[PDB]
């Protein structure tokens, strides 16, 4: 009888586990919404991220050695170096920053939660200045090298500040997940131990 | 087994009843104080 009563206390845990299946419904609903927001946003950055891997040594290396930078390439290129820490408006800092063989690595490295709001707001203003250039000019054809990394930098900002809407939701998802997972582990333990 | 479990839910009620024995201690303490105040006050009015 006592064992059975302990098994039935473990059935009270299976009732808590049914509450945690209601928490699974909450967790699934908010995750389906966050995964939809991530489908709406994230697939272009993955398409872009793959396009740096594609972009050829010859296309960039010829242009890095040019005597004078063309005006669409300058507008788009300066604001990428405002991500890449050596914030600067000078062609010879672009030449020194982009020469390194350690620049075939960090094309894919840069993350969207590292971006600061005033840096986002400046580039929204530089987007207001340079709106007819950007991806439109990349299609034009300034170069085969431009287009890819051009659209690369062009995004990132559309995650930013829209990721701050996903900061309560992901933090709420983490709280729901970590409480629900420990409790789901108690479920697998409870079913074994029943 | 089920009966026994219902009897043991009734033992959970006997645990609530032990809380209500703690409430009996609260009830007795405050009543001993009120009955003392009523002994200090009430016996002259009964004599009267």
From Swiss-Prot, chain B:
Highest taxon above the source species: Eukaryota
Disease connection: Charcot-Marie-Tooth disease, axonal, type 2O: An axonal form of Charcot-Marie-Tooth disease, a disorder of the peripheral nervous system, characterized by progressive weakness and atrophy, initially of the peroneal muscles and later of the distal muscles of the arms. Charcot-Marie-Tooth disease is classified in two main groups on the basis of electrophysiologic properties and histopathology: primary peripheral demyelinating neuropathies (designated CMT1 when they are dominantly inherited) and primary peripheral axonal neuropathies (CMT2). Cortical dysplasia, complex, with other brain malformations 13: An autosomal dominant disorder characterized by global developmental delay with impaired intellectual development. Some patients show signs of peripheral neuropathy, such as abnormal gait and hyporeflexia. CDCBM13 is associated with variable neuronal migration defects resulting in cortical malformations.
Protein name: Cytoplasmic dynein 1 heavy chain 1
Organism whose genome encodes this protein: Homo sapiens
Domain notes: Dynein heavy chains probably consist of an N-terminal stem (which binds cargo and interacts with other dynein components), and the head or motor domain. The motor contains six tandemly-linked AAA domains in the head, which form a ring. A stalk-like structure (formed by two of the coiled coil domains) protrudes between AAA 4 and AAA 5 and terminates in a microtubule-binding site. A seventh domain may also contribute to this ring; it is not clear whether the N-terminus or the C-terminus forms this extra domain.
Locations listed in the record: Cytoplasm, Cytoskeleton
Taxonomy of the source species: Eukaryota, Metazoa, Chordata, Craniata, Vertebrata
Membership in a protein family: Belongs to the dynein heavy chain family.
Subunit and partners: Homodimer. The cytoplasmic dynein 1 complex consists of two catalytic heavy chains (HCs) and a number of non-catalytic subunits presented by intermediate chains (ICs), light intermediate chains (LICs) and light chains (LCs); the composition seems to vary in respect to the IC, LIC and LC composition. The heavy chain homodimer serves as a scaffold for the probable homodimeric assembly of the respective non-catalytic subunits. The ICs and LICs bind directly to the HC dimer and dynein LCs assemble on the IC dimer. Interacts with DYNC1LI1; DYNC1LI1 and DYNC1LI2 bind mutually exclusive to DYNC1H1.
Shown part of the complete sequence: 3244 to 3291 of 4646
Function: Cytoplasmic dynein 1 acts as a motor for the intracellular retrograde motility of vesicles and organelles along microtubules. Dynein has ATPase activity; the force-producing power stroke is thought to occur on release of ADP. Plays a role in mitotic spindle assembly and metaphase plate congression.
């Amino acid at each position: 009888v006592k064992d059975q009563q302990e098994a039935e206390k473990k059935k009270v845990m299976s009732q808590e586990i049914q509450e945690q299946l209601h928490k699974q419904q909450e967790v699934i609903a908010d995750k389906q919404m966050s995964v939809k927001e991530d489908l709406d946003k994230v697939e272009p950055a993955v398409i872009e991220a793959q396009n740096a891997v594609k972009s050829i040594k010859k296309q960039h290396l010829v242009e890095v050695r040019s005597m004078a930078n063309p005006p669409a390439a300058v507008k788009l290129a300066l604001e990428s170096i405002c991500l890449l820490l050596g914030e600067s408006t000078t062609d010879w800092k672009q030449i020194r920053s982009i020469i390194m063989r350690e620049n075939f690595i960090p094309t894919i490295v840069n993350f969207s939660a590292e971006e600061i709001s005033d840096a986002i707001r400046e580039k929204m203003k530089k987007n207001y200045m340079s709106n007819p250039s950007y991806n439109y000019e990349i299609v034009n054809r300034a170069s085969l090298a431009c287009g890819p990394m051009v659209k690369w930098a062009i995004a990132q900002l559309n995650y930013a500040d829209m990721l701050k809407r996903v900061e309560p939701l992901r933090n709420e998802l983490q709280k729901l997940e970590d409480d629900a997972k420990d409790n789901q582990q108690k479920a697998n333990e409870v079913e074994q131990m029943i």
